[PDB]
Amino acid sequence: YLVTSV
Amino acid sequence: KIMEIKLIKGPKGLGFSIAGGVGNQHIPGDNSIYVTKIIEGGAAHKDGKLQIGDKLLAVNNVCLEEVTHEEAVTALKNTSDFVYLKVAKP
Amino acid sequence: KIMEIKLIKGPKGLGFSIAGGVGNQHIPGDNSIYVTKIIEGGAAHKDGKLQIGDKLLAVNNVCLEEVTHEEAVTALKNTSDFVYLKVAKPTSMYM
Amino acid sequence: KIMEIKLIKGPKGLGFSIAGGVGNQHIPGDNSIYVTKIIEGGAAHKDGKLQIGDKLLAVNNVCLEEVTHEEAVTALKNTSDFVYLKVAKPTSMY
Amino acid sequence: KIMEIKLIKGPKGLGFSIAGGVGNQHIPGDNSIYVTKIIEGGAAHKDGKLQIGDKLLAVNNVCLEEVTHEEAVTALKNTSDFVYLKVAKP
Amino acid sequence: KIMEIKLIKGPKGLGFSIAGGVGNQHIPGDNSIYVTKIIEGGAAHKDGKLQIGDKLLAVNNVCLEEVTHEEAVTALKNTSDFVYLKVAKPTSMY
């Protein structure tokens, strides 16, 4: 949601 | 100084989150891409080397210095399962 | 050796998954397209010839050697129901 | 099945490869012209609509059905800068 | 490239499948007749010389270069018990 | 039946042992390469997927079906840091 996860 | 971290991407990805980039500084004055989370149960967690606060310098020969957030995300997702990360520890 | 497989799509397509491509190596130092998954009850499965780990050489005579992953997906999807797969098969030197 | 694609020709041209043609059958029994590669950066790529596997029926009112490969290559090379491509997309039952 | 295969038709016939021909190209640009399958038990199999991928040049010196599929099938089935096959090996 | 495994080689290598091959049958009438040991704490072990009795089918794009023991060893030691293996999983303890 706020985190950008790879 | 620099550390090499090799990872096999899982079905869920590498298992970490990032912040930073040109136009999106994580630290005032600094365009670098930083690891902000290591995901519970993920490939980065299982391997154990990558840690929150690590600066990403490169992924698979793609430079991650002075790139936008979007470029970094795109470079990190459009890789094969064989992931080589170059990383600077605080 | 090259094996030719003729598939007729079911309701869920050809019933397999692929990996590989230029920029997306499934095997180190190799850009080729590989079958990674064959779905139970789907067309590939029922035909019986295709296997996990098979290198795809062409689909309907479109060469899958040195292409991107996106090109390979399109070449497989953008087809009629009758699909001709060319697949590489390993053979014995005898020794 | 049928779609119409409008292209402005690039300095590199339309940016795609074709196979097929009478005596050069891309699929057994089929003389049609097929798209086999979209070249990165080119006119067809930038537009985004043309796909590998697309059958070409016409370019600017010049018919590409039941022609040789060489004819198709000439008809495509010899267009003005504004190009209308009539194409057929393969369809399924589902 | 060229070898001769002499066969004696079985009760099941010659026991191989063919593709190709003018208007039905097995390989783009190529009109030739190709063997696509050798049936187990059959005469071609028992003899052993014919292989998937062989190009049929003639049957009983009936020329199979530049013919239709149907003409190739007709030629093959109109043979007697004794068959002379002219083939090219890739 | 068939499994694909991707490993990162350790300081000590892949961390498994093999037997079999043409001229060196692990099982009478069978020339295949078999995994006979998983080294504790090694790369294969940490990954978890490779197991004793697995038939080796390929290392990277080197086919290991119907090769000699010497060819399999060479091909396994011939790897860099990232390694692909293709295996057939046994159906019986036997």
User: Residue E87's CB: how many other CB atoms inside 10 A?
Assistant: 22
In terms of C-beta density within 10 A (0-12 exposed, 13-18 middle, 19 or more buried), how is residue D76 classed?
A: buried
Q: Can you say whether the dihedral through the CA atoms of E24, E30, E31, E34 is positive or negative?
A: negative
The secondary structure of B30-81, three-state, reads: ECCEEEEEECCCCHHHHHCCCCCCCEEEEECCEECCCCEHHHHHHHHHCCCC
In CATH terms, C1-95 corresponds, of 2.60.120.10, 2.30.42.10, 3.30.2130.30, 3.30.70.920, to 2.30.42.10
User: What's the longest Cα–Cα distance across chain B?
Assistant: 35
Class of domain B1-90: mainly beta
The secondary structure of C28-84, three-state, reads: CCECCEEEEEECCCCHHHHHCCCCCCCEEEEECCEECCCCCHHHHHHHHHCCCCEEE
CA C60 – CA C83 distance, rounded (Å): 6
| Technique used by the depositors | X-ray
Residue pair E83/E63 in contact by the 8 Å Cβ criterion: no
F40 touches chain B (CB under 8 A): no
**Which 3 state secondary structure label does DSSP give E81?**
coil
Residue pair E43/E15 in contact by the 8 Å Cβ criterion: yes
Task: Please give the backbone phi and psi of residue C17, each rounded to the nearest 5 degrees, phi first.
Answer: -120, 155
CA F36 – CA F3 distance, rounded (Å): 17
Beta strands at D55-59 and D62-63: parallel, antiparallel or unpaired: antiparallel
Bridge partner list, C28: none
Give the tokens for residue F19.
């037997």
Q: Which helix (H) or strand (E) holds E83?
A: strand E82-88
Distances (CA, A) of E52 to C18, E15, F2, F57: 27, 12, 27, 25
Q: Which of E12, E8, E19, E70 is nearest to E39 (CA)?
A: E12
Per the listing, tokens 């399958």 go with: E37
| Domain formed by D1-94, architecture | Roll (2.30)
Residue pair D42/D14 in contact by the 8 Å Cβ criterion: yes
In chain D, residues with a C-beta closer than 8 Å to the C-beta of E30 are: none
Q: With an 8 Å Cβ cutoff, are A4 and B13 in contact?
A: no
- Mutate one of D25, D30, D31, D70 to test the E interface: name it (highest E CB count within 10 A): D25
Residue C63: partners with Cβ closer than 8 Å, 6 or more residues away: C57, D36
Q: What one-character-per-residue DSSP string does D36-88 give?
A: EEE-TTSHHHHH----TTPEEEEETTEE-TT--HHHHHHHHHT--SEEEEEEE
C17 touches chain B (CB under 8 A): no
Q: What 8-state DSSP symbol labels residue E31? A: -
Q: With an 8 Å Cβ cutoff, are C80 and D90 in contact?
A: yes
User: Residue D88's CB: how many other CB atoms inside 10 A?
Assistant: 15
Task: Tell me which chain B residue has its CA closest to the CA of residue F84.
Answer: B82
Beta strands at B16-20 and B55-59: parallel, antiparallel or unpaired: unpaired
In terms of C-beta density within 10 A (0-12 exposed, 13-18 middle, 19 or more buried), how is residue B35 classed?
A: buried
Q: Do chains B and A touch (3 or more CB pairs under 8 A)?
A: yes
CA A2 – CA B24 distance, rounded (Å): 13
Give the tokens for residue B63.
């430079």
Degrees, nearest 5: CA angle F91-C90-F28: 45
Q: With an 8 Å Cβ cutoff, are C78 and D27 in contact?
A: no
Q: Can you say whether the dihedral through the CA atoms of D19, D20, D22, D23 is positive or negative?
A: positive
Q: Looking at chain B, which subunits does it touch, using at least 3 CB pairs closer than 8 Å as the criterion?
A: A, C, F
CA B44 – CA A5 distance, rounded (Å): 12
**Which 3 state secondary structure label does DSSP give C30?**
strand
In chain A, residues with a C-beta closer than 8 Å to the C-beta of B69 are: 4
Q: Do chains F and C touch (3 or more CB pairs under 8 A)?
A: yes
User: Residue F68's CB: how many other CB atoms inside 10 A?
Assistant: 17
Q: With an 8 Å Cβ cutoff, are B13 and A5 in contact?
A: yes
Q: Looking at chain A, which subunits does it touch, using at least 3 CB pairs closer than 8 Å as the criterion?
A: B
CA E56 – CA C15 distance, rounded (Å): 35
CA C37 – CA C18 distance, rounded (Å): 7
The region that residue C71 occupies, defined by phi over 0 for left and psi between -120 and 50 for alpha, beta otherwise, is alpha
Rounded to a whole number, what is the distance in Å from the CA of E19 to chain D's nearest CA? 9
Give the tokens for residue C57.
């050489």
Q: Using CA atoms in the order B12, B13, B17, B21, what is the torsion angle rounded to 10 degrees?
A: -140
E41 touches chain D (CB under 8 A): no
Q: Looking at chain C, which subunits does it touch, using at least 3 CB pairs closer than 8 Å as the criterion?
A: B, D, F
Give the tokens for residue D52.
């590998």
Give the tokens for residue E76.
């093959």
**Number of residues in chain B:** 90
Task: Tell me which chain B residue has its CA closest to the CA of residue C26.
Answer: B80
Q: Which amino acid is at B16?
A: F
C36 touches chain D (CB under 8 A): no
Beta strands at C2-8 and E16-20: parallel, antiparallel or unpaired: unpaired
